[PDB]
Amino acid sequence: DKRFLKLLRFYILLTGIPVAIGITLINVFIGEAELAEIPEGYVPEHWEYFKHPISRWIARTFF
Amino acid sequence: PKYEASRLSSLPTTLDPAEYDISSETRKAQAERLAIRSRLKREYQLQYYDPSRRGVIEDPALVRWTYARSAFGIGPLVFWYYVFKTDRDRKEKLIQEGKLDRTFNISY
Amino acid sequence: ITKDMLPGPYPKTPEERAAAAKKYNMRVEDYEPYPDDGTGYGDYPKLPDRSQQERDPWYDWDHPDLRLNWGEPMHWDLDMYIRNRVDTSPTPVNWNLMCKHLFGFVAFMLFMFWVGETYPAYQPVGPKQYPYNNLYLERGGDPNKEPEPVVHYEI
Amino acid sequence: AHIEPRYRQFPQLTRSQVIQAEFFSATMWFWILWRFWHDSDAVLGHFPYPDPSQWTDEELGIPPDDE
Amino acid sequence: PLTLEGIKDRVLYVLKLYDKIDPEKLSVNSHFMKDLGLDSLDQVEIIMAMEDEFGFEIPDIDAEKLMCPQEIVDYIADKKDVYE
Amino acid sequence: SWDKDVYPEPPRRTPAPSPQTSLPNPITYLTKAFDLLVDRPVTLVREFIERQHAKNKYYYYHREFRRVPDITECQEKDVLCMFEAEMQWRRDYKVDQEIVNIIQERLKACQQREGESHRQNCAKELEQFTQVVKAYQDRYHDLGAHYSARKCLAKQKQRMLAERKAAKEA
Amino acid sequence: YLTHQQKVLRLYKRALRHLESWCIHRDKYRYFACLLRARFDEHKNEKDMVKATQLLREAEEEFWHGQHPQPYIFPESPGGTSYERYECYKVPEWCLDDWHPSEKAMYPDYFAKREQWKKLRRESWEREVKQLQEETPVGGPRTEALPPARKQGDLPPLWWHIVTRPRERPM
Amino acid sequence: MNMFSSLSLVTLLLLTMPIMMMSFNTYKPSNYPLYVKTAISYAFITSMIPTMMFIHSGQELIISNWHWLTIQTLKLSLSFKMDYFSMMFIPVALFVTWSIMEFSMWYMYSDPNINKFFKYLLLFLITMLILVTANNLFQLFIGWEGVGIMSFLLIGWWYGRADANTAALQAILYNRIGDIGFILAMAWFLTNLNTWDLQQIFMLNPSDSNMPLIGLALAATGKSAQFGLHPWLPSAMEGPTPVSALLHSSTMVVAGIFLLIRFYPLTENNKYIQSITLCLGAITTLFTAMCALTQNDIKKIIAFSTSSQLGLMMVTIGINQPYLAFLHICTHAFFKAMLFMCSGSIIHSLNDEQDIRKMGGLFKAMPFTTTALIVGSLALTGMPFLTGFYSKDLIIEAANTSYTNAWALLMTLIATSFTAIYSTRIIFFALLGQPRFPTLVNINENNPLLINSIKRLLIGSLFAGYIISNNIPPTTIPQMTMPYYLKTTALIVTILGFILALEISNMTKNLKYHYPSNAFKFSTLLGYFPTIMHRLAPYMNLSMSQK
Amino acid sequence: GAHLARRYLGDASVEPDPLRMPTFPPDYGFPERKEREMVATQQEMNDAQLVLQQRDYCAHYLIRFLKCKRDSFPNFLACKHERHDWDYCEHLDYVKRMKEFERERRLLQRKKRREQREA
Amino acid sequence: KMELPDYKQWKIEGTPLETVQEKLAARGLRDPWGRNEAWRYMGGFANNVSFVGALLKGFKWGFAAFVVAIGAEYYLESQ
Ligand SMILES: CCCCCCCCCCCCO[C@@H]1O[C@H](CO)[C@@H](O[C@H]2O[C@H](CO)[C@@H](O)[C@H](O)[C@H]2O)[C@H](O)[C@H]1O
Ligand SMILES: CCCCCCCCCCCCO[C@@H]1O[C@H](CO)[C@@H](O[C@H]2O[C@H](CO)[C@@H](O)[C@H](O)[C@H]2O)[C@H](O)[C@H]1O
Ligand SMILES: CCCCCCCCCCCCO[C@@H]1O[C@H](CO)[C@@H](O[C@H]2O[C@H](CO)[C@@H](O)[C@H](O)[C@H]2O)[C@H](O)[C@H]1O
Ligand SMILES: *C(=O)CCCCCCCCCCCCC
C-alpha cells in the first residue's frame, strides 16, 4: 500500500512540478494580454480573442 | 401480565411451557440435532485446521442459500399517474388563466 | 457442488422429503418446506423467523458476527435478520402495550398543542406602536403612493 | 507511572490536582457572588411592575357611567 | 497488567472474605464441594464474586466447571492473556 | 478595473474615529502590523511582477459579431439562412443570460451593502431586476431543451395575438 | 438441553444480577440478596420433581415481571458498551506470511520463532488427524468435545487456532 | 477590510493545511495529533481578529472569491458570509475543538489509528465551518452533508463492533430523511426566486414561504434530532467519547438550529412556521428530558440532555428570538463539551465503565473532574451568572411573556425542572455515596493534557456567557418588564427540580423493595419509539424489497 | 396571568382581544390627546442601520448607546448608563401598552354596564 | 509485585453493613459476603459529602475572596 502511494506521488509530481513551475514562469514574465479595441482595418487571428498566454497557445496550436 | 409474543418480539425461552415439558422423545431429538451439528463441525474443522490449505472453505449451505435467493404490482403506477396527472392538470389550467405566480421563475 | 446438493422443486412424495431434509443437513422431523404456492421457494426449508441476535452469543460459532455455523441451513431471510438489521428479541414490555402507550402519548400531545393554539398565552398589553405611519417607507412601501396615516397618542 | 494503583484503598492524589480543583471551585463561587452583588436585578427584576387595578379612571380616560 | 501470582492472590483473597469458608482449609487446590463442603448455590455466588473482583463476566456454561481456586486462576489467566 | 456604470457603487462614507476611551485600540496596532508585515512585502512582489509585464505588452480583443437577418426573414426550410439566424439567436440568448446575471449581482450587492436598511434602500435594484426577469421570461421561458429561434418566434406570435385580442376586448 | 439443576442455578445468578441493578447500593443489595437466597433455600430439598418444576416455572414468570428494563451489563459482555470494540484490531496470524521480506527483516528473532511453530504445526497434523479417526465412532462424533493428547510428544488435536488466536487487546 | 477578509480566509485555509500535508510533505507522524492541535490553536487566534473588528464597528463582509459554475441565469460562486453568526460561532467552535483535541491526545493515546482519528476530527471541523460560513444553499449543502458523512465515519470508529456500524448507519438514515426537506427548500427557492444565494432570497422576501420553510424545518428536525427523527443522537454514543463531545457541542447537532437561524428573515414573517417550530421544540425538550431521568449510561444521559437543550433552541426559534437561540448555541457548547470530557475522565479511570450504577464515591477521588462536573451541571441548570444563565434565563423570560402556545410554554417549563433532576442524578450516582466499582483502583486524573483541556472549558463555562453577552450588539428589544412570578420562573422550577430530585435519589438508599411502574418503563425504554420503529419500519421495507 | 383566566374561563365580552384592540376611538373619554413625539428622524435610523423592530419611539436612546459602545472599544463595560437609558425608555413604552390594555378593559366593562342599564 | 492489604482489616462493624446484618438476624438469616464489601465503607471512602456539601465546594474560599473584593471596592468608593 505504501509503495503504490509513493509511486502515485512520484508520477503526479514528475510532470506536476515542471507544469507548476512552467505556469508560474509564464504568468510572471509573459503575463496576460491586455484588452484593446480592434484597430480600424485590422483583422485579429482567432487566437487573439483570448487573454491568457496558454489559452492563446492552445487555440493557435490545436483548435 | 402474561407475556404476549409478536412477530417482532419472540416469547422468552424461560417463559415457554415446552422448555420444561421434556420427554425421552424430546431428548432424543436434541441428541440427533447435536449429532448433526457435531458432524458438520468436525468436517469444517478438518479443513479449517489443515496447515496446507489456502483458500476458501466453500459452504454448500451458503451456496444453497444464494442459489435459492437469486432464482400492488401496477396499482402504485396507476395511483401515481393520477396524482401527477391531477396535479399537472390543475397547474396547467392556472397558468393559462394567469392565476399561477411565476414572477421570478426563469429556471427550469 | 452438484445439482443433487442444490435446491430443488417443491417435494411431493415423502421420499423427496427425506432426501430434501438430508440435503439441508436437517432431520426429517424438522424439515418443512414453504407452502407450495407460487412464490418460488422450492424445497428450501422454512426455519423459525428469528433474528440472529437471539442466538447464544457465548457459543463458538464458525461465524461469530453472523452467529452461524458452517454447513447449518441459513434462514431464507438471513440478510434481513443479521444483527445490524431486524431484531426480534423478547422485550420486557409486551409489544401491544408498547404501541398503545406510545400512540397514546403522541395523540395526547397533538391534542394539547391544538388546545394551546386555540387559547394562547399573552401579556395584558396593547399592540406595539411604531412611528412614521407604521414605518411605511422602511417596510418597502411605495413612496409615490401616499399612505393613509396611522396616529399614536400619549397615555 | 507517577501514581501506583491501590487495592481496596482510596487512591493516591497529587498536590497539584487538589489545589487546582479547589481554586476553580472557589473561583466559581466568587464569580457568582460578585455578579449577584452587582447584577441582582438580572435575577429579581429590572423595573417595578405596575398594579393596573390601582390606576385611576381619569388617567385612563374612562368616562363616568352616566355621561 | 495482571500476573499469575497477582491473580492467585486476589482469587484467594476473595475466598478468605467468604464466611462459609474456613481460611485454614483454603489452598489453591481446595475443591469447593468435596473439600470445603459448599453448595452449588454457594459456588454460583463465588463465581459472581470473581466476576465483580475482576470486572468481566464468566458465562454460565464455563462457570459451572470452576470448582477449585486454581481452576478460577487458570480461567482468568487464559481469558486475559496472562502468561507469567 | 471594471466599468463603474455597469457595476455601480454609491460613494463610501466611513466615519472618522472618535475614541472616548483611554485603552489603546488593538485593531489599530494590528492594522499597522498588517501593513508592515503582510501588505508591504506583498506590494513589493507585485511591483516586481508588473515590471516584467510592462516589458512585454501584447493585446487581445473582444470578438464583434456582425448582425445577420433574423429567423423572421428566413424562407421556410432554407437551412443556409436559418443556420445564420439560428446561430445569432443562440448568441443573443447567451448574452441575455449574462444580462440577467449582471442585474442579479447588482441586487445582491445592494442587499449586503445596505445592511439592515436594505428593504428600503434597494428598491431601484429590485425594480430593475423585476423588469428584466419579466422580459427574459417572455423571450425564453417554456421553450424546452430543444429550443430554437423558430420556437421562440412561435411563442412571440402567440403572445402578440393574445395582446391584439385583448386590445380589441378593451 | 439443560438439566433442571442448571436451570435453577442460571435463574439464581440472573435473578441476583437484576436485583443488583435495582438496589444499586451494596448494603441494600446485600440485604435483599440474602432474602433471595432464603427463598431458594426454602425449596432446596423438594423431592417431588413435578412440584420442583412448577416452582421453577413460577420463579421464571415472577422474574419476567420483576426484571430490570435496563440491567447492568459488564462492558465486554455481549450487549455491553465495549463488546467487540477491539475486533477491528485483531489481525489473523496468517497475514504475516504475506509481509514483504524487508518488513520481515525488522523482526528477525520473532519470525525465526514463528518458523518453529509452523514446523511444529506441520509435523503434528498427521498424528492429530489419525487420533481423531481412531477415537471417533462410526457415523461421526455425537458431541463437539475434543480429546487431549494421549501420548508424550503428541499435541491435542486441532490446537492451532486456539493457541495462536489474537490477544484480547492486540494493540 | 483587507485585513478583515485576509484573516477570515486564513482561518479556514490554516485548518486544511494539516490535511494537505498528509500527502508526504514534511509530515511528522511522530506527533501528528499535536500538529493538528496546534493548527486549531492558531486558527482560533487568527479568527479572534475579525471577531474583534466586528465587535468594534459591526463590520461584515461577503467574500465571493471564486466563480465555479454558471447555469444560465444562476451563478454559483464560492462565497463566504463573514457576518454576526459566523464571527461569533467560529471562535467558539475553535476554542472548544482546541480543548477536545487536547483531551483526545490523552484519551485516544493507545489507539493505533490516533493519526487517522485526528484527521477525521479535523475534517469534521472543516466541513462544519463550510456550513456556517456558506452564503449560498449549494455551498451550505456541501457542509450539511459533509458533517453527516464525518459523523458516520466517527460514530462507526470501532468498525469491528456491529452496534457501532448500526448506530453509524442509523445516523445517516435519519439525517438523510431531513435532507429531503433541505432539497425541497433548494428546489423551491430556485423555481420561485431564481437563486440559491441568501442575499437574493432575503431581498425578494417571499410571502408564501410555507413550503420552503417546512422543508427547512424538516432538515433541522433530522440534523438537530427533534422529535420524530431523534433516536439517532442517543445511539451516536457508540463513537469514542471525543466524538460525542464534538458532535454534541460545536458540530452536527446545532447545524439544524443554525440553518433556521440563518433564515430568520423569512421565519420572522411566517407565524404558521413559528407555531410548528415552537410545538416541535416543546415536545422534543420535554420528551428527551424525560428519557434522561431513567438512563443509567452516563453518555446516554448527556446525549438526551443535548436533545433536550436542542429542543429549547427550537422553541426559541418558534417564539421569534433567533438571536437568543444563537446565543444558547454558543453558551451550550462550552459546558456540554466539558460534561462529556468529565464523563470520559470518569470512564477512563474506571476501565471503560459507563454505567452510573457502578460509579459512586468519586467526589474526593477525582477532585478536578468533580469540580468541572459540578460547574458544568450548574451551568446547564441555569445557575445565575454562569455561562448557561446568560441564554437560558433570557429564553424563559422571552417565552413567558410572548404571545405563544400555552401548552408549549408549559412543556418547556417542566423540561427545565427535569434538567435539574437528571443533572442531580449524574452527580448523586457518580460522585456521592460509596464506591461501587471494582477493587483494583486505577483512578488517576493527573495528566496535563486532561487537566488543561478541561480547565479551558471550565473557564469558558464560567465567563464565556458574560463576556459574549456584553460584546454582541443588540438586534432586538429585550423584554425586561414582567411580574415577579414570570421573572423568576426559571430559577424556581430549577430549584424545585433539585429539591424533588434529592428526595427521590435519597429514597434509593432505603431498605425497601422497588417495583417498576408503567411510567418508569416508558422513560427507561425511551418511550418505546426505537423499539417499535427500528423493528417495524426495517421489517416492512426489507420484507417488501425481496419480493 | 390572571387576565387569561377571565377571558377563557369567565366572560370574554369584557376582556380585550389582543389582536383586535384598540376597539374604541383614541379620543373617546380623552379631551385633546397629544401625539407621541419621535425624536430620531427616519434618516438617522436609516443611517444608523437600526433593525426595523428597534425603530420605535425609543430609537434615539439606542442610537446614543450604539455610538458609545463603538467609541469605547475595547472597553466592553463603558456604556452602562446609556444602556440603562434605553432600557428604561422601553420600560416606559411597555407600561403605555399596559395602560392601553387596561383602558380598553374598563371601557368594555363600561359598555357592558350600559347595555344592562339600557335593558 | 503488588502487596495486598491484610484481609483481616475488613470488618462490617461500624458500617451500614452492620445494620443489614442486624435486620437479617431478626429473620434468622445471615450475610456471608459482608466482609467482601467492607472496604467500600472504610478508610478514605468512609465519609463522603452530601449533595449540598458537593454543591458548596469552594464556597468558603470563594466567599472569603468575595468579601475582600467588595471591601476593596467599597473603600475606593469613599476615595
Ligand atoms: C503548463 C504547460 C503548458 C505549455 C504550453 C504553453 C506554453 C506556450 C507559451 C506561449 C505564450 C506566448 O504568448 C505570446 O507572447 C508574445 C509576447 O510578445 C506575444 O507577441 C506578439 O504580440 C506582440 C505584438 O504582436 C509582440 O509581443 C510581438 O511582436 C508578437 O510576437 C504573442 O501575441 C503571444 O501569443
Ligand atoms: C490535450 C493534449 C492533446 C495532445 C495533442 C497531440 C499533438 C497534436 C499536434 C498537432 C499539431 C498541429 O499543428 C499544425 O501546425 C501549427 C501548430 O503546430 C498549426 O497551424 C497554426 O500554427 C502556426 C504556428 O506558427 C501558425 O502559423 C498559424 O497559427 C497556423 O499555421 C496547426 O495546428 C497545424 O497546422
Ligand atoms: C406532559 C404530560 C404527559 C402525559 C401523557 C399522558 C398520555 C400518554 C399515556 C396514555 C396511556 C393510555 O393507555 C391506554 O389504556 C391502558 C393503559 O392506560 C392500556 O391497556 C392496559 O393498560 C394497563 C396495563 O396493562 C391496564 O391496567 C389496563 O387495564 C389496560 O387497559 C392501553 O394499551 C392503552 O391504550
Ligand atoms: C400570564 O401572565 C401569562 C403567562 C403564564 C403562562 C401559563 C402556563 C401554562 C398554561 C397551561 C394550560 C394548558 C392549556 C393549553
Sign of CA dihedral H434, H438, H442, H445: negative
What is the residue with the minimal CA distance to atom 2 of ligand 4?
I1
Asked whether I31 and C149 are in contact (CB, 8 A), the reply is no
Chain I residues in contact with H56 by the CB 8 A cut-off are: 70, 73-74
Which residues surround ligand 3 with Cβ inside 6 Å? Answer: C 97, 100-101, 104-105, 108
Find, in chain E, the residue whose alpha carbon is nearest to that of J6. Answer: E13
Tell me, in angstroms, the distance from the centre of ligand 4 to residue J17's CA: 50
Please report the residues numbered 25 through 54 in chain B whose beta carbons come closer than 8 angstroms to any beta carbon of chain C. 29, 32-33, 36-37, 40-41, 43-44
End-to-end Cα spacing for chain G: 39
Chain I residues in contact with F10 by the CB 8 A cut-off are: none
Task: Show Cβ contacts of residue G101 under 8 Å, excluding neighbours closer than 6 positions.
Answer: none
Asked whether C155 and I37 are in contact (CB, 8 A), the reply is no
CB atoms within 10 A of CB G118: 14
Ligand number with the minimum distance to the CA of C103: 3
Tell me, in angstroms, the distance from the centre of ligand 2 to residue F58's CA: 21
Choose the closest CB to G140 out of B15, B30, B38.
B38
For residue H74, list its beta bridge partners: H71
Chain F residues in contact with C132 by the CB 8 A cut-off are: none
As a whole number of angstroms, the distance between CA F107 and CA H204 comes to 10
Find, in chain C, the residue whose alpha carbon is nearest to that of I105. Answer: C124
Pocket residue to mutate for ligand 4, from H417, H486, H492, most atoms within 8 A of Cβ: H486
Tell me, yes or no, if E10 comes closer than 8 A to chain J by beta carbon.
yes
Asked whether I97 and C125 are in contact (CB, 8 A), the reply is yes
Which residue is associated with the grid cell 487487546? G169
As a whole number of angstroms, the distance between CA C127 and CA H314 comes to 26
Give the determination technique. Answer: cryo-EM
- Enter the C-alpha cell of residue E19: 464466611
- Enter the C-alpha cell of residue E37: 463442603
- How far does the CA of residue H93 sit from the closest CA of chain G (Å)? 29
- How many contacts does F have with H, using Cβ atoms within 8 A? 54
For residue B67, give the nearest of C50, C44, C27 by alpha carbon.
C44
Chain H residues in contact with I74 by the CB 8 A cut-off are: 52, 56
For residue H95, give the nearest of H306, H335, H334 by alpha carbon.
H334
Atom of ligand 4 nearest to the CA of H400: 4
- Enter the C-alpha cell of residue G44: 432446596
As a whole number of angstroms, the distance between CA G78 and CA E50 comes to 18
**Does the C-beta of I8 come closer than 6 Å to ligand 4?**
no
Asked whether I60 and I42 are in contact (CB, 8 A), the reply is no
Asked whether H489 and H400 are in contact (CB, 8 A), the reply is yes
Resolution in A: 2.4
Q: What is the dihedral of CA H126, H129, H131, H135, to 10 degrees?
A: -130
Alpha-helix runs per DSSP H in B49-74: 60-70
Counting CB pairs under 8 A, whether chains I and F reach 3 or more, is: yes
What single-letter DSSP state applies at residue H30? G
Mutate to test the interface with F, among H72, H86, H476 (most CBs of F within 10 A): H72
Q: How many CA atoms lie within 13 A of G94 on its CB side?
A: 11
* CA I116 and chain centroid, separation: 33
Q: Across the interface, do I97 and C151 touch by the CB < 8 Å criterion?
A: no
Q: Across the interface, do C84 and H169 touch by the CB < 8 Å criterion?
A: yes
- How many contacts does G have with H, using Cβ atoms within 8 A? 71
Sign of CA dihedral J35, J40, J41, J46: positive
Please report the residues numbered 3 through 62 in chain D whose beta carbons come closer than 8 angstroms to any beta carbon of chain J. 5, 7-10, 22, 24-34, 37
- Enter the C-alpha cell of residue G16: 441476583
For residue G63, give the nearest of G123, G7, G121, G14 by alpha carbon.
G14
Ligand number with the minimum distance to the CA of A60: 2
β-pairing verdict for A34-35 and F59-60: parallel
As a whole number of angstroms, the distance between CA C125 and CA I16 comes to 9
Atom of ligand 2 nearest to the CA of A47: 29
**Does the C-beta of A29 come closer than 6 Å to ligand 2?**
no
Chain C residues in contact with G78 by the CB 8 A cut-off are: 57-58
Q: Angle at Cα H358 formed by Cα H357 and Cα H360, nearest 5°? A: 85
For residue H49, give the nearest of F34, F16, I49, I66 by alpha carbon.
F34
Please report the residues numbered 71 through 130 in chain C whose beta carbons come closer than 8 angstroms to any beta carbon of chain E. none
Asked whether E20 and E42 are in contact (CB, 8 A), the reply is yes
For residue E19, give the nearest of H490, H393, J29 by alpha carbon.
J29
- How far does the CA of residue I56 sit from the closest CA of chain H (Å)? 10
Ligand number with the minimum distance to the CA of H413: 4
Tell me, in angstroms, the distance from the centre of ligand 1 to residue A36's CA: 16
What single-letter DSSP state applies at residue H71? E
Task: Show Cβ contacts of residue A47 under 8 Å, excluding neighbours closer than 6 positions.
Answer: A56, A57, A59, A60, A63
Which residue is associated with the grid cell 449451505? B61
Question: Which residues of E are the active-site residues?
Answer: 39
Pocket residue to mutate for ligand 4, from H283, H409, H485, H489, most atoms within 8 A of Cβ: H409
The DSSP secondary structure of H372-422, one letter per residue, reads HHHHHHHHHTT-TTSTTHHHHHHHHHHHHTSSB-HHHHHHHHHHHHHHHHH
The DSSP secondary structure of G19-65, one letter per residue, reads HHHHH-SHHHHHHHHHHHHHHHHHTTT---HHHHHHHHHHHHHHHHH
Residue B89 burial (10 A CB sphere; 0-12, 13-18, 19+): exposed
As a whole number of angstroms, the distance between CA D19 and CA D12 comes to 15
Pocket residue to mutate for ligand 2, from A15, A56, A61, most atoms within 8 A of Cβ: A61
For residue B22, give the nearest of H276, C31, H495, G3 by alpha carbon.
G3
As a whole number of angstroms, the distance between CA H359 and CA H350 comes to 8
For residue D6, list its beta bridge partners: H441
Tell me, in angstroms, the distance from the centre of ligand 3 to residue E35's CA: 56
What is the residue with the minimal CA distance to atom 20 of ligand 3?
C97
What is the residue with the minimal CA distance to atom 20 of ligand 2?
A61
What single-letter DSSP state applies at residue H74? E
- How far does the CA of residue C22 sit from the closest CA of chain G (Å)? 14
- Enter the C-alpha cell of residue C23: 440435503
Q: Which long-range contacts (CB under 8 A, 24 or more apart) does J46-52 make?
A: J48/H361, J48/H363, J48/H364, J48/H432, J48/H433, J48/H434, J49/H363, J49/H432, J50/H432, J51/H424, J51/H427, J51/H428, J51/H432, J51/H502, J51/H505
Residue J45 burial (10 A CB sphere; 0-12, 13-18, 19+): buried
Which residue is associated with the grid cell 443479521? C82
For residue H308, give the nearest of H130, H497, H112, H544 by alpha carbon.
H497
The count of residues in chain H is 547
As a whole number of angstroms, the distance between CA C137 and CA D16 comes to 65
